[PDB]
């Protein structure tokens, strides 16, 4: 029997990522999932800002986009309810009226600054028509180290899955899971807590049972890929969709049903060492995103991870409409934003009251 001396890192059981930021990543993930707090998703693209400014008649300039983020980031008091803010690349280098860059402002107020590091959806080529992959892994290490250098401590990367004909192709399940896992391990190497966002989209006529079965299949493969690539589970976060009926299904589900389908799906696939789940709001209304999260935090099913929010439209929609892009509306906009933040803060704790809301 021949024998050879090999490196431990050449043996499959020793594939865990070795990163000097491991202790810091774990501490950041705990900070981000503090009780009663969640994430503000302010990482809309320049294109996405055109859709937000449409209703209020605001021109889509870099300065008006700066004021759009400033309406919320320079609002006093949101650190009671927001543990971290996902910034767009542009906003990372823009400055607040206080004179600081927005990452500096957030670190002064105890809020973790984060950055969306993916480079957008592209056609998957493989699989079925309409399925998409996410670009952005080339040069990722250089980008992430620069985002860390200017104060960011977590990041976000979004993959999408389109339910068509009650299913998704196995190509998109394998490929998108591999992308997220590779993204996650590269982020931890550079000191950013990876938020893994595998979004099973709401588009289509599928019912909530179809969403349950596709979501579990998709998330299980994401978890398997994270194992393969050696992620540090304790310094990682998941941003999944809630299990809900399709947008054009004609079906409806109560908050208690959505909570049960979602938690039971997560409980079947998601290791408890993962510190937190930050739900995306997607195609839910402001009140419905708070109502569903509240139901999630009153579930009898097992849920060892923190169940909180990472909301964009569900936190800013009423604020933008009251703001109107005009300096006279800042007071009204911030009143709406802070109300949404308080509601979702209460929803995280399980004490959201529908009668105290809109």
């Amino acid at each position, epitope marked *: 029997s021949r024998r050879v001396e090999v490196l431990l890192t050449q043996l499959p059981a020793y594939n865990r990522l070795k990163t000097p930021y491991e202790e810091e990543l774990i501490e950041t993930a705990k900070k981000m999932t503090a009780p009663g707090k969640g994430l503000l998703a302010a990482d809309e693209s320049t294109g996405s800002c055109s859709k937000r400014f449409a209703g209020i008649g605001l021109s889509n300039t870099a300065e008006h986009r700066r004021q759009y983020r400033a309406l919320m980031l320079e609002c*006093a*008091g949101f650190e009671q309810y927001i543990s971290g803010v996902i910034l767009h690349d542009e906003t990372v280098y823009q400055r607040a009226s206080t004179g600081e860059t927005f990452p500096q402002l957030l670190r002064r107020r105890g809020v973790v600054p984060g950055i969306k590091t993916d480079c957008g959806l592209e056609p998957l080529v493989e699989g079925a028509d309409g399925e998409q992959m996410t670009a952005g892994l080339d040069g990722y290490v250089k980008r992430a180290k620069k985002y860390y250098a200017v104060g960011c401590r977590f990041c976000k990367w979004r993959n999408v899955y389109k339910i068509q004909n009650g299913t998704v192709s196995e190509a998109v399940v394998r490929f998108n899971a591999e992308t997220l896992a590779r993204y996650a391990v590269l982020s931890q190497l550079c000191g950013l807590v990876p938020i893994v966002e595998p979004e099973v989209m709401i588009d289509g006529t599928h019912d909530i049972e179809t969403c349950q079965r596709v979501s579990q299949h998709v998330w299980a493969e994401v978890v398997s890929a994270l194992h393969r690539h050696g992620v540090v589970w304790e310094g990682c976060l998941l941003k999944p969709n809630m299990v809900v009926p399709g947008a054009e299904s004609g079906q409806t589900a109560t908050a208690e049903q959505v909570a049960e389908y979602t938690v039971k799906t997560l409980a079947r696939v998601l290791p408890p060492a993962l510190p937190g789940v930050t739900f995306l709001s997607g195609g839910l209304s402001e009140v419905m995103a708070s109502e569903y999260l509240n139901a999630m935090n009153n579930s009898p099913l097992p849920r060892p991870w923190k169940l909180t929010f990472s909301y964009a439209r569900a936190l800013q929609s009423s604020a933008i409409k009251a703001w109107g892009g005009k300096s006279s509306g800042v007071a009204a906009g911030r009143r709406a934003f802070m109300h949404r933040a308080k509601m979702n803060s209460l929803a995280q704790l399980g004490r959201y009251n529908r009668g105290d809301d809109d």
Partner: nanobody
Amino acid sequence: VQLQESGGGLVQPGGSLRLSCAASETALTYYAIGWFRQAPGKEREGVSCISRINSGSGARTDYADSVKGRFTISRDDAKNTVTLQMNSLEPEDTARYYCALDTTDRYDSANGRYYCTISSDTYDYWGQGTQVTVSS
């Protein structure tokens, strides 16, 4: 959400009162706090503001000219209250006194400090007030 003011009442000139500002479900430590007043037939004027605590140096304060030297504003972040100590009250001080929060992040990074303003433009969550009458 709205704040709860207390401490007002009826006093003779030269006397003193202590107004208190309380919050139920809000942490005042995250805001600059302002005291305002409205006199019969006049508009709402700023009386005193106090910034957030500047680490290791305490809070910065400001006062309207007509009250400087007599009024003192302070804050206790632990008890979640804002206090206005009014001393040696004159009859032009009779009014309804309000508490409010500054909804703007009042930080000046060139100067490395939290600050405050008595201007009511960015204040919100006004309470119901407390009446102060100074009369013989």
